[PDB]
Design a protein around this ligand. Structure first.
Ligand code: HEM
Length: 153
């Protein structure tokens, strides 16, 4: 359970992200795919991209980055009361996209790296710790739905 003070830190940096959703989403997916190449293989849509320059040039990758960050933003702004938003996401990522919880850890590390790069004055250690807690709460709740469905592994 995050405290109100921890949520305020999370949402204050998140408000900065919402000024350039697409730029952040590109940086976060490119970092995920470079750091953890197994993740790129889950996207039939992107598995043709072989270089960071090709990733940066892909408008369809930039579009998906916006989709991802808009869904994450809607979850964060619920401050934990996010059951309605997580249900469908867990369901599609377990049963259709086949994404292991570990890959949600990896994309959480990529988000935190990008926020620190782009927003260092609003992403000191207090805020990094709070964002880490928010993203762990996301993963915990998705993992419980995966387990329900037979995918926690
Ligand atoms: C913060 C974490 C994430 C969020 C909020 C998120 C969000 C979304 C949303 C909103 C969609 C489209 C609606 C749907 O299918 O449910 C989607 C699609 C998808 N996601 Fe995620 N996602 C996340 C992490 C991941 C990770 C880590 C992977 C792979 C490693 C992944 C793989 C996919 C795939 C393969 C699709 C379908 C893309 C396509 O072919 O159109 N997601 N995601």
């Amino acid at each position: 359970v995050l405290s109100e003070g921890e949520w305020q830190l999370v949402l204050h940096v998140w408000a900065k992200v919402e000024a350039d959703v697409a730029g952040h989403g590109q940086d976060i997916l490119i970092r995920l795919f470079k750091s953890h190449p197994e993740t790129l293989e889950k996207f039939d849509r992107f598995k043709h991209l072989k270089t960071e320059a090709e990733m940066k040039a892909s408008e369809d990758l930039k579009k998906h980055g916006v989709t991802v960050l808009t869904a994450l933003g809607a979850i964060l702004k619920k401050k934990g009361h996010h059951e309605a938003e997580l249900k469908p996401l867990a369901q599609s990522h377990a049963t259709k996209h086949k994404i292991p919880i570990k890959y949600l850890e990896f994309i959480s590390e990529a988000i935190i790296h990008v926020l620190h790069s782009r927003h260092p004055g609003d992403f000191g250690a207090d805020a990094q710790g709070a964002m880490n807690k928010a993203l762990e709460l996301f993963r915990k709740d998705i993992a419980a739905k995966y387990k329900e469905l037979g995918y926690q592994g």
